[PDB]
Amino acid sequence: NIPTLPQNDPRPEQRAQQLDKARETYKYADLLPPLAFCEGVPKPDTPSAAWLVTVGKVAAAVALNAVANRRAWKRFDVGGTSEEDQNEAGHNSFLARLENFDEPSVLDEVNERVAAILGAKPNRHVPPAQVSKDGPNGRPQSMDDYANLFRRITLPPIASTWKNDSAFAAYRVAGPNASMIQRITELPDNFAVTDAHYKQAMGEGDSLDAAKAEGRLFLADWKLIGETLVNNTYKGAQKTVYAPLALFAVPPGGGSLAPVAIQPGQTPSPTNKIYATQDGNDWLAAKSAVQVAEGNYHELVSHLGLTHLLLEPIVMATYRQLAQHHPIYMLLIPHFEGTLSINNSAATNLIAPGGAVDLIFAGTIESEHQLALAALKRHDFMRSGLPDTIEQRGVGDTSVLTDYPYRDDGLKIWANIERWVTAYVNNYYISEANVTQDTELQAWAAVLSKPFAEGGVSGFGPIDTRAALIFACTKVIFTASAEHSAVNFPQKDLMSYAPAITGAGWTAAPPSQGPLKDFQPPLELAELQAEFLYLLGGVHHTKLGFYNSNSFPYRAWFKDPKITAELLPAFQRDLAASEELIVAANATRTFKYTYMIPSTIPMSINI
């Protein structure tokens, strides 16, 4: 079969009949308000049996790690539950390998375990066998209690370097939120850093006035955190998050980013000062308090807000407006596999009251919803292309800021995706009148160009040109694939160890008042942090550039031989070429960046 535009379609009546059964099975729901959701998981969008196997093993190791921690605490009840978890690992390897089947062990246990891990439920010890003082709980004896949680999952490498200044800056260029630094030519008024602060970090051979003239100053401003969040308590203990401003500078002649100064609050005050690279014990807490903001910021703005919830109305619009015989449907749908499913799990378990975000992260759970919705509301879709953002922020000069993996590796993947969309769109769209007269695309653009309050994407209009459609398909494919990988998998590697970065600060301020362990979360929360961020960051199911189905054959999804034999293999080579160039650069990097390597990038949002 060859996909076709609706006007040129030889059989329109049977086409518009199919879009009726689509909108009948893809209704709208209010799971998260001011947004466009799907009513549960529609039967087609259910997780594939290959997904459940992959996710199952991770949830099993996470379950086994909780059993190991419960053996260590209170040093048969912890052995029987240890082996039933092992039995599901046996189930997954063989019972699920039936695959044809024509699910029991696979479907039931996996989804149940996933919900129990993201729902922060009290007894994720063993399933089908109907805070606990018998496991790690309360305040810490020493800082060994935080690393010791990783008993059946491996302690991340950041656990042994997170105190280094070089790691603190690497988070801004190769971490979970690597898209927030902005070039400044003059410092803000609420952040009056001094040259004495500067010369403590960049040495005596540089000046703050030189860096502002020569484009070497970079600001990270978590102002939005102060606008939306409300500090909550957990078990009567005060959770604290700040809205800091962090200054960074590259050594003269170009190079890596280097921290300079930190102000924990937005507005200066007697109790709000500027801590610098030499202030020592307070400086380490100022860096840690910045990480606390990043956790709430990444997980709700960068991550869930601007990947999952951003594409959810587009996933809902594509199904409802573009027929299965539409080429754009053929382009976008396999980049949406599991997006409906995982977003429904994130809505009712992750960011629902009593969820992992609610207890761990500092703000009240609803104030976190406002943080996310405010990011989508202020977002500008038609100007959010990766090359476009980089020249808006002033980070695009490869000579001044040389070490910036996300920019260097991501811009490559962006170029590959645009070329393959520019090829796809131009094969089916041969006239700029083919665009305007595509009623399905125009009705697809409508429900997306709606006001954000009515349920649209902020800034989605207009899509009247072959160029404009190429951008929309490049951005969507990027965020579905690379951007989500640039934020989802750093959770396993960089965010699973609470002292390195967590969702709350458990003492009052950077001005250090004593031992570092008092700032860290309680143990029962910190295990949940390690285990739920492990599961979210440890699933690479589906590979960018490999368009297949979610059914048992996992056969090729494209049908047109023009794309099958010519255009898609033209795409997969680009990613293979970029892979070697990225893998080359990543060897010579001390702080690894694997997230733009096309062998690992997923096609869609599924975890």
Q: By the criterion CB under 8 A, which residues form the site for a copy of itself?
A: 2, 4, 7-14, 83, 86-87, 90-91, 94-95, 98, 100-102, 104-105, 141-144, 146-148, 155, 159-161, 163-164, 497
- Is residue 358 within 8 A of residue 386, CB to CB? The reply is no
User: 410: which 2 tokens?
Assistant: 């991501």
Would you call the peptide bond into 462 cis, given omega within 30 degrees of 0 as the criterion?
A: yes
Distance CA 11, CA 15 (A): 6
CB of 2 vs a copy of itself, minimal distance in Å: 7
Closer Cβ to a copy of itself, 9 or 214, answer by number: 9
For residue 73, which of 160, 151, 153, 143 has the smallest C-alpha distance? 151
Residue 38, SS3?
A: strand
Closer Cβ to a copy of itself, 96 or 373, answer by number: 96
CB of 288 vs a copy of itself, minimal distance in Å: 14
450: left (phi over 0), alpha (psi -120 to 50) or beta: beta
Residue 559, SS3?
A: coil
Closer Cβ to a copy of itself, 160 or 590, answer by number: 160
Cα torsion angle, 218, 220, 223, 224, sign: positive
> Where are the strands (E) in 427-515, listed by range?
none
Closer Cβ to a copy of itself, 5 or 58, answer by number: 5
CB of 142 vs a copy of itself, minimal distance in Å: 4
Question: What separation in angstroms does the CA of 252 have from each of 166, 172, 520?
Answer: 16, 19, 36
Closer Cβ to a copy of itself, 191 or 275, answer by number: 275
- Is residue 232 within 8 A of residue 153, CB to CB? The reply is no
Closer Cβ to a copy of itself, 420 or 497, answer by number: 497
For residue 374, which of 489, 267, 479, 297 has the smallest C-alpha distance? 297
- Is residue 181 within 8 A of residue 218, CB to CB? The reply is yes
Closer Cβ to a copy of itself, 160 or 436, answer by number: 160
Is beta strand 37-38 parallel, antiparallel or unpaired with respect to 182-183?
unpaired
What's the 3-state SS for 254-268?
A: CECCEEEEEECCCCC
Closer Cβ to a copy of itself, 142 or 269, answer by number: 142
CB of 157 vs a copy of itself, minimal distance in Å: 8
CB of 101 vs a copy of itself, minimal distance in Å: 8
Cβ-based neighbours of 424, under 8 Å, separated by 6 or more: 327, 331, 473, 563, 567
Closer Cβ to a copy of itself, 203 or 280, answer by number: 280
Distance CA 30, CA 173 (A): 36
